[PDB]
Write a protein that binds this ligand. Structure first.
Ligand code: 0PL
Ligand code: CL
Length: 289
């Protein structure tokens, strides 16, 4: 559509915020709160509807991993509950193929999932598919040419540079070339023929580096680093540019929003979120009402 939506996230506790940024004019709009606060969720769009998937409610009265799927209709400014997933999935990644939502990995307490499940909006149903070859939480997910990619993350013991690809018609996962950088909670998205992985955490440091995988060459190449080191960032594509939103730099929960121009290989500061936060869900759709 035309707006970048940011849902949930974390600052001091899990957040219920839904806010929409308009790159055309720089404005932010605050919209209807999520029914349940959540950080470590993912956002996606199917048929112009915005979905918030998984996460965890870290609140002063308990911590609860979410198996929730909720649907935001920009036409009504209302959130509606959908069928819940088979399992809670905190620090989840998601991808959309052919109008179906894949929920990938994430944690439930000390359980780090390799499992994957697929949502069909037409029947409001989840179904498990083949699990990944690797347990991954803080996993980056993107879709390119109707193939689903799971990139980096944390397996319970180590942060990962590994990545793998799901071939739907074979219901099968296969490893791809690993990234040059260990990244957990990177922002992962697609632009042109490349899967980009921006920032993340390696067990020691939050990262500013950005690399991209060309499916034709099966190789990863670094591009210009972001202006800010950041893990648990939100990422999306809007008009052929990558936008990264918030995250954590080892010091501050960032309000910084940066944009990448692939043609000039440059990052620029574009706006600030209304407040600093990390672990948001982000996606793009039409403006409300
Ligand atoms: C930071 N968010 C949670 C989150 C963490 C990680 C990794 C997990 C890991 O590699 O173990 C992680 C862990 C620790 C990190 C890290 C990344 N970066 N710095 N530090 C110290 C990856 C994605 C998300 Cl959304 S969040 O915003 O949802 C959040 C923040 C505070 C408390 C709870 C959740
Ligand atoms: Cl968490």
């Amino acid at each position: 559509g035309r707006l970048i939506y940011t849902a949930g996230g974390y600052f001091r506790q899990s957040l219920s915020y839904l806010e929409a940024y308009n790159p055309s004019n720089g404005s932010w709009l605050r919209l209807a709160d999520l029914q349940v606060p959540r950080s470590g969720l993912a956002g996606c769009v199917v048929g112009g509807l915005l979905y918030a998937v998984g996460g965890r409610n870290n609140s002063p009265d308990g911590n609860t991993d979410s198996s929730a799927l909720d649907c935001y209709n920009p036409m009504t400014n209302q959130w509606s509950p959908c069928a819940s997933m088979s399992v809670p999935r905190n620090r989840i990644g998601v991808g959309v193929i052919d109008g179906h939502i894949y929920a990938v990995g994430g944690s439930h307490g000390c359980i780090h999932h390799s499992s994957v499940e697929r949502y069909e909006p037409e029947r409001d149903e989840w179904h498990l598919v083949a699990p990944m070859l690797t347990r991954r939480i803080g996993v980056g997910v993107a879709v390119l040419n109707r193939l689903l990619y799971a990139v980096g993350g944390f397996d319970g013991t180590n942060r990962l540079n590994s990545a793998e690809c799901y071939y739907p018609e074979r219901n099968e996962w296969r490893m791809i070339t690993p990234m040059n950088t260990i990244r957990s909670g990177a922002g992962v998205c697609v632009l042109h023929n490349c899967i980009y992985a921006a920032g993340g955490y390696d067990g020691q440091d939050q990262l500013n580096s950005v690399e991209r995988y060309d499916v034709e060459t099966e190789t990863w190449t670094f591009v210009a680093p972001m202006r800010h080191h950041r893990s648990a960032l939100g990422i999306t594509v809007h008009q052929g540019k990558i936008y990264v939103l918030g995250g954590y730099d080892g010091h501050t929960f960032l309000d910084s929003v940066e944009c990448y121009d692939p043609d000039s290989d440059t990052w620029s500061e574009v706006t600030r979120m209304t407040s600093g936060r990390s672990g948001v869900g982000v996606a793009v759709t039409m403006e409300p009402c």
